[PDB]
Every structure is written in structure tokens, then in C-alpha cells.
Write a protein that binds this DNA or RNA. Structure first.
Length: 84
DNA sequence: GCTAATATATGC
DNA sequence: GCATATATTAGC
């Protein structure tokens, strides 16, 4: 399942890696910036969260479990990718 | 449920 | 004020 701390963990990660919502939204759960923004604003309790949300949150949780180094390379690649 | 567009906000 | 980032929400 998903932890109710996911929202804090995502906020913690954005700050740590100094990345934008767009970059994280794409690589972590394949969605756009505005969606992540709303997801973060609402901060819905995962226990009353729709299955669509749960899919997005679990995808974010799994991505955060990757090694720090791997997540950093992935962010960098996405930056260059959109840079084009 | 989302994306894409764009009004606002933020870091220099 | 330029370059990006984030908040909003119309249209699919």
C-alpha cells in the first residue's frame, strides 16, 4: 500500500534534489506538473483516496525507494530531455 | 482524471 | 525584467 507520509516524502525529495514538480511528476509517476501540484495541494488521506490516486502515489513511493544516485541520474536525464 | 495553456509567483 | 517554477482551470 501507500504511506500517509508520502506527501511529506515527495516534498522532502523535491527540496533535496532541487528539482521541479514537472521533472518529478514525469519520472516518478508519468504525469504532468499541474497534476502533481493539485495532488500535493489536496494531500488526500490514502485511505479515502481513489484508485487512480493510489496508482499515482504508489508509483511515487516506489520511485523514491530507488537509490539516491539512481534517482539523481534520472532527474538529470529528464532535464536534458525536456531541454530539447 | 489529465493535459496543456497561461496567470502568478519565485530566484536571480 | 528574464528565466523558471507553481497554481489554476478550460477543454478533452
Amino acid at each position: 500500500e501507500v504511506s500517509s507520509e508520502i506527501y511529506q516524502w515527495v516534498r522532502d525529495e523535491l527540496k533535496r534534489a532541487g528539482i521541479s514538480q514537472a521533472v518529478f511528476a514525469r519520472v516518478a509517476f508519468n504525469r504532468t506538473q499541474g497534476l502533481l501540484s493539485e495532488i500535493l495541494r489536496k494531500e488526500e488521506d490514502p485511505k479515502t483516496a481513489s484508485q487512480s490516486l493510489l496508482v499515482n502515489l504508489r508509483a511515487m513511493q516506489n520511485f523514491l525507494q530507488l537509490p539516491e544516485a539512481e534517482r539523481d541520474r534520472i532527474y538529470q536525464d529528464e532535464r536534458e530531455r525536456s531541454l530539447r
